[PDB]
Symmetry: C2
Subunit: 103 residues, 2 copies
């Protein structure tokens, strides 16, 4: 309902975790689980490549269609670009239904 493709076997969940690294333990044995760990975090890159199949348009509509377009006249900033502060932003929601089709 929120939109999209419903899949019985969707892309799998990808779980990740930093392995706990004990800080020095006591010198004489104790049953209790360790609760003192070295403070750490991780970082790295991640890549996702997806192949999409397109269904080309085959319309005999004579007149031009509606199309998503960038604004023409001057503006303080560029839509879908960064700030003077380096902040990226999406000015508006962009749908998918521009071309038309008969029923």
């Amino acid at each position: 309902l929120m939109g999209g493709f419903g899949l019985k076997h969707p892309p799998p969940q990808i779980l990740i975790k930093n392995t706990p690294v004990p800080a020095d333990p006591p010198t004489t044995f104790n049953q209790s689980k360790l609760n003192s760990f070295i403070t750490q975090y991780s970082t790295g890159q991640v890549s996702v490549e997806i192949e999409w199949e397109l269904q080309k348009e085959n319309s005999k509509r004579w007149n031009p269609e509606i199309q998503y377009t960038s604004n023409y006249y001057k503006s303080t900033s560029v839509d879908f670009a960064v700030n003077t502060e380096g902040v990226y932003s999406e000015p508006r929601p962009i749908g998918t239904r521009y071309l038309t089709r008969n029923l």
Copy 2:
């Protein structure tokens, strides 16, 4: 200068003409060229097929481009369609420069 492609050997001129058909001539010989012809005209269909090579766009521009689009809101008629009188019309001139390219 009016725009377009300059060709040393452009598509050839295609000339057409209805052959003159004499109306009855005099019964005794006369030097003069005939000047009395049967009234006629011709009609038929004509076809032109042209193959065009396209140079696809290869831009890394992140933000959307400007695009020619049909108007969104209601209107008395449809742009680039016929009249209630069956008259076709081109509401505006449509150029060719929407996508962008670096220098």
